[PDB]
Amino acid sequence: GQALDAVRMRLAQLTHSLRRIRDEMSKAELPQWYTLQSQLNVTLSQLVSVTSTLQHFQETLDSTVVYPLPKFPTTSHESLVTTLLRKKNIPEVDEWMKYVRETSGEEIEKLLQQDREITNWARTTFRNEYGKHDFK
Amino acid sequence: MQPPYIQERLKSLNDIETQLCSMLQEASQVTFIFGELKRGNESVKPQFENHVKQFYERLDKSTTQLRKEIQLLDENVGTNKKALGQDTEKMEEQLDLLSAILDPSKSK
């Protein structure tokens, strides 16, 4: 419950930041560019923290089993239950990665290791380039 | 016109921003080339080293030259005034006009 509690508080503050950026964008007059950058960076790094913390506690979330309350009436709130129950993605993202995979399209493994060696080589090359010139 | 010193100062500054533009352009080409390098054709691999080296050497010496300019600012300290003579020069030209008026052989 502790992990889900931390997820709750962090997601609540993320939703609060979203409500903020919403009600300062809803104005008919656009504020200064710099305030928009500050709000963007803060909210976006907060989203990063959301992702990282959700990553950290996957085991606690998975272990939990969902069950409706005995006191909760489904006869009158079945629509509300179904609203939270449904999880299928929005369609546009679906065909989005479908076209993405269409465009992308032992052989695969050796290309994978070739990518490994290119990555390592590029990292070493840029380390050497940084070391070549004194930046301090 | 301005004294020459300001002229080469502004030339050096203009060179500075042109070098910055060249650095941005070379960043564009290196970002371009890395894409196909990730794609998997090794022909343009040698060009990558040259592009990276030229990009870094363009980034460094530009900042170095700008640092030299800001340093020049440090020792350049200590190194209507025209109005004080302005009326005088006006005076001069007016009398010149009178001369042109005074001589009828020069009014042609």
Q: What angle is formed at CA B97 by the lines to CA B96 and CA B101, rounded to 5 degrees? A: 120
Name the packing angle between helices A2-25 and A33-56 (round to 10°).
Answer: 160
Cβ contact, residue pair B56, A125, below 8 Å: no
Cβ contact, residue pair A115, B57, below 8 Å: no
Q: How was this structure obtained?
A: cryo-EM
CA–CA distance, A119 with A114 (Å, rounded to integer): 9
Q: Å from A129 to nearest chain B CA?
A: 7
Q: What is the 3-state secondary structure (H, E, C) of A59-114?
A: HHHHHCCCCCCCCCCHHHHHHHHHHHHCCCCCHHHHHHHHHHHHHHCCHHHHHHHH
Under DSSP, the state recorded for A53 is H
Instruction: Please report the resolution in angstroms.
Output: 4.3
Residue by residue, DSSP assigns B53-103 as HHHHHHHHHHHHHHHHHHHHHHHHTT--TTHHHHHHHHHHHHHHHHHHHH-
Do residues B58 and B16 make contact, with C-beta atoms less than 8 angstroms apart? no
CA–CA distance, B40 with B34 (Å, rounded to integer): 10
Q: Å from B25 to nearest chain A CA?
A: 19
Do residues A86 and B12 make contact, with C-beta atoms less than 8 angstroms apart? no
Q: Does B61 touch chain A (CB under 8 A)?
A: no
- At A12 the three-state DSSP class reads helix
Number of A:B CB contacts under 8 A? 18
Please state whether A65 falls in left (phi above 0), alpha (psi between -120 and 50) or beta: beta
CA–CA distance, B44 with B47 (Å, rounded to integer): 5
Side chain identity, residue B67? R
Cβ contact, residue pair B37, A118, below 8 Å: yes
From the list B28, B55, B34, the residue with the least C-alpha distance to A119 is B34
CA–CA distance, B68 with A118 (Å, rounded to integer): 39
Tell me the residues of A at the B interface, defined by beta carbons under 8 Å apart.
Answer: 111, 114-115, 118, 122, 125-126, 129-130, 132-133
**CB burial readout A57-73, b (16+ within 10 A) else e:** eeeeeeeeeeeeeeeee
Residue in chain B lying closest to A131 (CA): B56
**CB burial readout B18-55, b (16+ within 10 A) else e:** ebeeebeebeeebeebbeebeeeeeeeeeebeebbeeb
CA–CA distance, A33 with B84 (Å, rounded to integer): 48
CA–CA distance, B106 with B28 (Å, rounded to integer): 66
Q: Going by C-beta distance under 8 Å and a sequence separation of 6 or more, which residues neighbour residue A21? A: A39, A40, A43
Cβ contact, residue pair A133, B57, below 8 Å: yes
Cβ contact, residue pair A129, B52, below 8 Å: yes
First vs last C-alpha separation in chain B: 32
Q: Å from B35 to nearest chain A CA?
A: 12
Residue in the block written with tokens 């560019």 = A33
Sign of the C-alpha dihedral, residues B49, B53, B59, B62?
A: negative
From the list A23, A20, A12, A9, the residue with the least C-alpha distance to A42 is A20
Cβ contact, residue pair B38, A118, below 8 Å: yes
